[PDB]
Symmetry: D2
Subunit: 209 residues, 4 copies
C-alpha cells in the first residue's frame, strides 16, 4: 500500500481554507501556496537519516547531527510547482532544483511533458516533487516515470489538494512513493477538476487564464 | 500537573542548531538560522491550536473550511536577543501581536513593556534564544500573568536543566519548546555546550 | 533610433555581480544574488511607470495618494534560467502576471502561456545572460506578434554581439543589464561572463 | 552647507506609501510595506557608496570586480517602529552590524525618552543607516544621532517613510552633516505632535499594540 499522510495541523488547514476563497488575489494565493508548501516540507523531512559528528563549537568540541547522504533535489512541476518551491527551499536552500514542465490536455485530461532537466547522480538522492493539485494523477505519474527512468529510488510527493481518483491512480502506478497532502477532497467534476478543490491553481498563481 | 517540555528532535531542527554551534559561523548565517529554527519551533507550539468549521464561498460554490478560534496570538520577544527570533515566529503567524518586554537583572525588574490589549484572552509565545538560569524568562512570565494571561508557551533555541527546573517550579502551567536540552552552566551562567553570547552573535556587536 | 541601453552601475549591483563571478560560489549564494540583482534591475526599469492620483481615507481624514496607472505588467521568464530571476522581479511587483515562454527555433516556441490583453501591458522579459541574443529576439518576436508594444529586457550580463543583434531586430525595446562584458568565447559563453548561469542557479551539471 | 535631503519619487515608492496611508490597513500588510519601502530607500541611500577595484578568480580566469570600501555598515533601528523597516535594509546589506537604540516619545512633552542602546564597536570607522518610520518633531532622531556622534560615528544617513517640515528643520539645525532619505515630506504636525497626513501611530500599527 502507498504511504499517505494528510497534514491536519491547524495552520495548514487554516491557510488551505483561505486559498479556497473564490475572490482571493493572485498575490495572496501565491504567498499561501508557498507558505503551505513550506509546512508540508517539514512533515515530509521528519524521517530524514542523521549522523553524529564532532565540530569546533563556541566552547571547544561539541557533537552535532547532520543530514546523511547527498543533497536533496526539489522537483517543481511547471508552472504551478514554482508557486510552492520557495517554501521548500526555505528549509533546504542547498537542494538541487530539477525543473519538470507538464501541462494537461483539457480535452483528454492526459499529461503533456514539454520540459525536463534533472540533477546528476539522482540515483543517490531523495526527490521532493511539488505540485499544488493531484486530480487524475496523470501529471504526477508522468513525473515519477522520468525520475525512476533517471534512476531515482527515494521519492516524496507534496501537494495542497488531492482527489481520491488521483490517489488511486498514483498508488497502483507507483506505490513506493510517499504522498503528503494538505487535504483529501471529495472527487473530480465532469471537466476533471478537483471539488471542492482550488480551481485552476496554475493560471491563478501565474495570473493567466 | 508537571511542566510539559518538548525537545524538538526533527532532523532539520537538529541540523540547523548544530550549524549555529560552529565557532567560525558568521552573524549573517547565525541570524538566519536563529529565525529558521524559530519558525520550526512555532509550528510545533501551534499544533494544538483549536479550530472551528465555517462556510465560505469556494471556487465551486459553498465549502466548509476550518479557522483558528479565539483572538490573535501575541509574540513576546525579550530585549535584546528575543528580537532575533521574532522574524521566524511571525513567518507562520504574521497577524500575531508583538509584546516587547525588557527585564533588568538587579530580584529582576522590568524596565520596558508594551503588551497587547486583552492579553487575558490570548496565547502568548515568549521567545528568547537561551534559557540559562530562567531569571529573565520567569520575570517576563510573572509580568504576563499580572496582565491576566493564562495561556503561555516558551520558545528557546537551547535550555539548561537549571533554567528548566527554575521555570517548572515558578510556572508549571507554562509549556516549554526547545531545539536542545544542554548539559548545564559554567561558573559565569552561560549554557554549555550552548551557543555563546547569542545576542551579540545575532546583531554582530562584540 | 538607437536602442536605449541602461548599464546599472549602482555600487550594490556591481558589488553583488562581482560576488557571482567567484568560481567557488555555491548554488545557494548564486541563486540568492541572481534574484537580489534581479529585483534592483526591476526597480531601475520601473522608474518611468505612469501614476494617477486617487482619494483614500487616511488616519486623519481623506488624503490624495498615487497608484500605478494601466493594467498590471507581465514578467516574461525564458525557460529555464529565466525562472531563476522571476522571484526577484516579483518582489517589488508581486501583482505582475507571469508569461512563461519556451524557445527552440521563424522562431518556434515549444511552450507559451501569455497573459490576456498583453497589447495593453508592459512586458519585463527576464533571462540571466544575453550572449548572441537568439533566445531574447525569438521571445520578443512572439510577444510583438501577440500585440505587446511596450517591452523591457532585464539581464545580469550581456555581450556586445547580443546587444547589437537585439538592437537591429528590435530597436524599440529598452535593455537593462548589471554589466556589458567584452565578448564571447569559442563556445558562445560570455567572457568574463558568469559561466553556465542556468546550471549554477538550479545546481545541475 | 545645508542638510542634503532626498525625497524618493520612484512610482513604486509613492504607490506603496499610498497603501500604508489607508486607515483600515491590517498590521500584517502595514509591516510588509514598511520593510519593502525600507529596502527601496536603502538602495537610494547607498547609490554614493565608495567602491574599490579588486582582482578575483572568475569561472574563465582572473577578472577585476568592484567591492564596497571600508568596514561593514551599521544599521541603527530605533525601537520599536524601527524593526519594521530593518528587514528591508538587511536585504541589501545582510552582513551589516545591528546597533539597536530604544526610544519612546513622551506624548505629554514630545521629548524622547532613551531606555536602551547597544552600539557596534569601532563605529568611528563605519557608516550608520538610522531607520525609523516617522520624523515628526525630530527629537528621537536628534537624540539617536547624539549617541552615534558621542560614540565617534562621522558618516550618518537617515531613512524615514514620512517626514514633517518641523522635524526636517529641527534635524538640519542640530546635525546638518547627516543625509535625510524620506519617501515623503508631509504638510506638518497636528496639535498632538503627530504628522499629517502621516501614517498615524506607526509603532502600534507595526506591532499591533494599543
Ligand atoms: O496527521 C497529520 C499531522 O501529522 O499533522 C501535523 C500535526 O497536527 C500532527 O499531530 C498530525 O498527526
Ligand atoms: O514533523 C512531524 C511532527 O513531529 O512535527 C510537526 C508537528 O505537527 C508534530 O505533530 C509532528 O508529529
Ligand atoms: O509610557 C509608559 C511607559 O513609559 O511606562 C514605563 C515603561 O513600562 C515603558 O515601557 C512605558 O512606555
Ligand atoms: Cl550516528
Ligand atoms: Cl566524529
Ligand atoms: Cl554520508
Ligand atoms: Cl479540509
Ligand atoms: Cl487590557
Ligand atoms: Cl542536541
Ligand atoms: Cl487577448
Ligand atoms: Cl579568488
Amino acid at each position: 500500500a502507498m504511504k499517505i499522510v494528510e497534514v491536519k495541523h491547524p495552520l495548514v488547514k487554516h491557510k488551505l481554507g483561505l486559498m479556497r476563497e473564490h475572490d482571493i488575489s493572485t498575490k495572496r494565493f501565491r504567498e499561501l501556496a508557498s507558505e503551505v508548501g513550506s509546512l508540508l516540507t517539514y512533515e515530509a523531512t521528519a524521517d530524514l537519516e542523521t549522523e553524529k559528528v564532532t565540530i569546533e563549537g563556541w566552547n571547544g568540541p561539541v557533537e552535532v547531527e547532520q543530514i546523511k547522504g547527498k543533497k536533496i533535489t526539489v522537483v517543481p512541476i511547471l508552472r504551478a510547482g514554482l508557486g510552492m518551491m520557495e517554501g521548500v527551499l526555505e528549509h533546504v536552500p542547498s537542494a538541487r532544483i530539477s525543473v519538470v514542465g507538464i501541462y494537461r490536455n483539457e480535452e483528454t485530461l492526459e499529461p503533456v511533458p514539454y520540459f525536463q532537466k534533472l540533477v546528476s547522480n539522482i540515483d543517490e538522492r531523495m526527490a521532493l516533487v511539488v505540485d499544488p493539485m493531484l486530480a487524475t494523477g496523470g501529471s504526477m505519474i508522468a513525473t515519477i516515470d522520468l525520475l525512476k527512468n533517471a534512476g531515482c529510488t527515494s521519492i516524496k510527493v507534496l501537494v495542497l489538494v488531492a482527489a481520491p481518483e488521483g490517489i488511486a491512480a498514483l498508488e497502483k502506478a507507483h506505490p513506493d512513493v510517499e504522498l503528503y497532502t494538505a487535504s483529501v477532497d471529495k472527487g473530480l467534476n465532469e471537466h476533471g477538476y478537483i471539488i471542492p478543490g482550488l480551481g485552476d491553481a496554475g493560471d491563478k498563481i501565474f495570473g493567466t487564464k
